[PDB]
């Protein structure tokens, strides 16, 4: 069972937030499906559940603004959240509900969870990133290891994701927290530390994705050496 959230990362105040979860590996009719969110730095907040026969309930705080629905033909379920404000900026998770039929009470829990989609509620427009290589200079090797990286400048909203060599390079990879600048735009760096001997025989490419602006960059990072 794999759950794949999708939908805009940016919603203007008073507009409607719409997200969709595509389910593969099981029929959408087999399980109860829930949405959860987490405001940045805060705890987990339950939104609601749906079942394909129409059974639903919601967080009472959200009940008057929220609908969850199922699309049988595409094996999807969706969240609709009306009249959003900045209070609705959050990472939104779609989850499969598991349950055990024990008569007394309800045994209901969540497994698995989607990866989460950050939705930022803002009147500001989307801005795509510019990517610059952080190339190992003639003096930057540190013994037997060398760091290289990518600088991802001036995007909005979050997030950008960075992989290296299409995900084949994971050891030593670190993507830093984004810096919110005085301009209101974000920037971040991503680095990988590799054996110094590999700079002469291995290609390094940072794969930058900024879904809100539909931008993808594959940036070769060439050692100066």
């Amino acid at each position: 069972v794999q759950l794949l959230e999708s939908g805009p990362g940016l919603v203007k105040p008073s507009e409607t937030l719409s997200l969709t979860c595509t389910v593969s590996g099981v029929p959408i009719s087999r399980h109860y499906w829930n949405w959860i969110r987490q405001s940045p730095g805060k705890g987990l907040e339950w939104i609601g559940y749906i079942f394909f026969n129409g059974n639903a309930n919601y967080n009472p705080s959200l009940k008057s603004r929220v609908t969850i629905s199922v699309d049988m033909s595409k094996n999807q379920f969706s969240l609709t959240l009306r009249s959003v404000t900045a209070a609705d900026t959050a990472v939104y998770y779609c989850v499969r509900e598991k349950s055990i039929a024990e008569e007394d009470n309800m045994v209901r829990w969540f497994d698995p969870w989607g990866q989460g989609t950050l939705v930022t509620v803002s009147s500001a427009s989307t801005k795509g990133p510019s990517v610059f290589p952080l190339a190992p200079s003639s003096k930057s090797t540190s013994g037997g290891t060398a760091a290289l990286g990518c600088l991802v400048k001036d995007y909005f909203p979050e997030p950008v994701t960075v992989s290296w060599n299409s995900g084949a390079l994971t050891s030593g990879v670190h993507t830093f927290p984004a810096v919110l600048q005085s301009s209101g735009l974000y920037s971040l760096s991503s680095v990988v530390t590799v054996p110094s001997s590999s700079l002469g025989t291995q290609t390094y490419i940072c794969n930058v994705n900024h879904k809100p602006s539909n931008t993808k960059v594959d940036k070769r990072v060439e050692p100066k050496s």
Binding site: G43, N57, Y93, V107, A147, G149, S187
Partner: protein, 210 residues
Amino acid sequence: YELTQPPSVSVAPGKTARITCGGNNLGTKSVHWYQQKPGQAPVNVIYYDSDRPSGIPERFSGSKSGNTATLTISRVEAGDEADYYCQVWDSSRDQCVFGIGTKVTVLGQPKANPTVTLFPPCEELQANKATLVCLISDFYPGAVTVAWKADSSPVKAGVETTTPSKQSNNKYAASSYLSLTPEQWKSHRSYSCQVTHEGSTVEKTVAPTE
């Protein structure tokens, strides 16, 4: 209905961590536990009070009193640092309820000295910007100071430094950025990033030369 959790639990490596969740007549409700590591989605690690999902280490166990539930992590590893959330369903109102979360920190790991790399701007100059990037990798504990110099003079303007972030190997990394104009970058003979960690300093210097 409300679920109480301590905000913080600190544990030494190899010892046993206990995360408690309290609520009214919790004894009559089934309790479930989720682990959320930094930058990741939650994962179920205990359901139905004490059952362990497939693939979850047996170091994780769940138990229940009449008024509290406990997630116990035995032989704690640095990789177990995470926020842990308890969850129940309130059958009366058909509502899911989460605890406020407990941040588990594994203290007293072994000291690890930082590796510092300084990257000069090259291609960025043609965008009429110049960012020097000072990467600070693989250190523990997660506390550093960064000082920048142009020639021999300290520079504070245009400096931004991130809060140390945990790496996948459980050490910390941080980055510091110095913003210059392209003309300013060419106007000095050298720049330096000086990183102080645990009473020791590492300094890297670079000269304009693209």
